[PDB]
């Protein structure tokens, strides 16, 4: 028993982190087989970054313009291309530690692990969720561009995030490994706002189930609600609507606890309307929405 | 961004193995040519109720122990018991052994746990050792022998190996020399921990982290002595500070220019008067599982 924000083990990704430098600009890259993936703004000077014409800047670069270091070894760049906001550097050497991998595009509300890494050296690992407004609430500092987010299924690493930006509000933005931003953001040195965020309702409900599984029931009540009537109140509070698919994904948690989903929904509605008084749930004073149903089932199955 | 962060787990993943005796299986830690694991692996379920470990071990030979890295067996060639830990000498030195140390941590100290089932790592998360010598972890059946660690430079400091889940759902275990943290024993019995307290040095670290981020409404105009602060803190079920606690706050004190005892006086007012409906770092709750090193780490990007 117990419930904790948990990341996937990071070793398979650690073996792929390298450092990429062009001019006086340095960030992290991801070394898979004989290709190194990194944010394309590594080719910019401070002056270029305000309004970079990336295709124009890239064609003026030569392979020798790129310094790639994998620990204490320099990797020789023998080719370069760019796919949207991701620069791809061909090197003459295959990474022997390349895991089985895929590139995927994650959906809002799904979680992933981030390997924090600076100058190509891994520093920490933590779990994030893709927000409905396509931002991430992460812990990226200077030099964190090129950090990647991932999930691991069996032995396959599914890369879903590359880090590019910190917004003025302190949340973060980035791309998939195809170089497409999540959300309406652009890799230029400007202050950018996100759309209004919303709360990931299916994840709050999963987390309430985890709290019940771990002996926390104070927020339950004897009431039920219809799905529509729940969604009416949820939307009033800037919660995402709960779909029937979401209801279905929560089935196993409902079965384990014997609490119907719409019964939990009635609990959540009362919590939104009354607050938590001074009380906590799983040690939190706020309703947590960055655990998916799968995240909860993985830590609570059997308990 | 300020959030809980585990260390990268790869150096430890390469050291996880499975240890089985009969049908009893758990996890072990493979460093050089020795595997470390909880000694109750030698017990049947019924043996675990009231074990005499010295007697149970005399009956065991090297050939009764199955150690597997993945599906690959590592032949056991020696065995000995050290407190609550079994040490199995194996015929292969782990080529992935990192630079490592065995350390015994203080309450309040944090560490990463590599969750691991059947010798296969499944996740990593950050834990704090509570003042009552429990940890609020996430441990299912088959998690015994999971380890807790910190990584400084390229050296892994192992501090915890998992044994037990208490009735209340918190967790208990040993250091890597087999000595339990707290007054627990490795027997199949319901055991209770002392009443827990709040980790004062970590609350202070978090207040420094708030100040570093420009959130400083709670800075008051008073100071205090260490002794007067400790006596008042205990009335709020906060841990007394030690001299080591004062010392490890030093860098955060210097970074902000706020003397440690002035921060103590500020915390004391927060305890006596509450938050008055205000938050710190976006929380009405005073957080106590970030150490001074965690705050310096996750504000400066220390890598390993
Ligand atoms: C990368 O490490 C740079 O290579 C860096 C990551 C952030 C720095 C601090 N925390 C981070 O997550 N990213 C940037 O510096 C990006 C670079 C762009 C994509 C070329 N820019 C920003 O993060 C950025 C610029 C501005 C800004 O300007 C003007 C105004 C306000 C916010 C802001 N963020
Ligand atoms: C190990 O995996 C066993 O090798 C296991 C880990 C726990 C099971 C579920 N979550 C865990 O953290 N540990 C145990 O089963 C230990 C075995 C001892 C050390 C021999 N025992 C307990 O965790 C334990 C026993 C009892 C108990 O008895 C009766 C009554 C109440 C609680 C309790 N916990």
Curated annotation (Swiss-Prot), chain A:
Active site: 41, 145
Effect of residue 132 to H: In strain: Omicron/BA.1, Omicron/BA.2, Omicron/BA.2.12.1, Omicron/BA.2.75, Omicron/BA.4, Omicron/BA.5, Omicron/BQ.1.1, Omicron/XBB.1.5, Omicron/EG.5.1
Cytoplasmic-side positions: 1-303
Activity control, per UniProt: Inhibited by pyridone-containing alpha-ketoamides compounds 13a and 13b. In turn, alpha-ketoamide 13b (tert-butyl (1-((S)-1-(((S)-4-(benzylamino)-3,4-dioxo-1-((S)-2-oxopyrrolidin-3-yl)butan-2-yl)amino)-3-cyclopropyl-1-oxopropan-2-yl)-2-oxo-1,2-dihydropyridin-3-yl)carbamate) inhibits SARS-CoV-2 replication in human lung cells. Inhibited ex vivo by michael acceptor inhibitor N3. Inhibited ex vivo by compound 11a and 11b.
Domain of life from the UniProt record: Viruses
Protein name stated in the entry: 3C-like proteinase nsp5
Organism: Severe acute respiratory syndrome coronavirus 2
Domain Peptidase C30 residue range list: 1-303
Stated consequence of mutating residue 142 to A: Does not affect ability to cleave and inactivate human TRMT1
Subunit details: 3CL-PRO exists as monomer and homodimer. Only the homodimer shows catalytic activity. Interacts with host FBXO22; this interaction promotes the proteasomal degradation of nsp5.
Subcellular compartments: Host cytoplasm; Host Golgi apparatus; Host nucleus
Reactions it catalyzes: TSAVLQ-|-SGFRK-NH2 and SGVTFQ-|-GKFKK the two peptides corresponding to the two self-cleavage sites of the SARS 3C-like proteinase are the two most reactive peptide substrates. The enzyme exhibits a strong preference for substrates containing Gln at P1 position and Leu at P2 position
Cross-link (Glycyl lysine isopeptide (Lys-Gly) (interchain with G-Cter in ubiquitin)): 5, 90
Effect noted on mutating residue 189 to A: Does not affect ability to cleave and inactivate human TRMT1
Segments forming a coiled coil: none
Function: Cleaves the C-terminus of replicase polyprotein at 11 sites. Recognizes substrates containing the core sequence [ILMVF]-Q-|-[SGACN]. Cleaves and inactivates human TRMT1, preventing tRNA guanine(26)-dimethylation of tRNAs. May cleave human NLRP1 in lung epithelial cells, thereby activating the NLRP1 inflammasome pathway. May cleave human GSDMD, triggering alternative GSDME-mediated epithelial cell death upon activation of the NLRP1 inflammasome, which may enhance the release interleukins 1B, 6, 16 and 18. Also able to bind an ADP-ribose-1''-phosphate (ADRP).
């Amino acid at each position: 028993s117990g419930f904790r924000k948990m990341a996937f083990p990071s070793g398979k990704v650690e073996g792929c982190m390298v450092q990429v430098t062009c001019g006086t600009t340095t960030l992290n890259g991801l070394w898979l087989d004989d290709v190194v993936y990194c944010p394309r703004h590594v080719i910019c000077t401070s002056e270029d970054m305000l309004n970079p014409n990336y295709e124009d800047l890239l064609i003026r670069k030569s392979n020798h313009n790129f310094l790639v270091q994998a620990g204490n070894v320099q990797l020789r760049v023998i080719g370069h291309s760019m796919q949207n906001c991701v620069l791809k550097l061909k090197v003459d050497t295959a990474n022997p530690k390349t895991p089985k991998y895929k590139f995927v595009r994650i959906q809002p509300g799904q979680t992933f692990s981030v390997l924090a890494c600076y100058n190509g050296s891994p520093s920490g690992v933590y779990q994030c969720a893709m927000r409905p407004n396509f931002t991430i609430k992460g812990s990226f500092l200077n030099g964190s561009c090129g950090n990647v987010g991932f999930n691991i299924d069996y032995d396959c690493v599914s890369f879903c995030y590359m880090h590019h930006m910190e917004l003025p509000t302190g949340v973060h933005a980035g791309t998939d490994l195809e170089g497409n931003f999540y959300g309406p953001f652009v890799d230029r040195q400007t202050a950018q706002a996100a759309g209004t965020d919303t709360t990931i309702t299916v994840n709050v409900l999963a987390w309430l189930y985890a709290a019940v599984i771990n002996g926390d029931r104070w927020f339950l009540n004897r009431f039920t609600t219809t799905l529509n009537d729940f969604n009416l109140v949820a939307m009033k509070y800037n919660y995402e609507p709960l779909t029937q698919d979401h209801v279905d994904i929560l089935g196993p948690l409902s079965a384990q606890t014997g609490i119907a989903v719409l019964d939990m929904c009635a609990s959540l509605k009362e919590l939104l309307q009354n607050g938590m008084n001074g009380r906590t749930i799983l040690g939190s004073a706020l309703l947590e929405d960055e655990f998916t149903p799968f995240d909860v089932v993985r830590q609570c199955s059997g308990v």
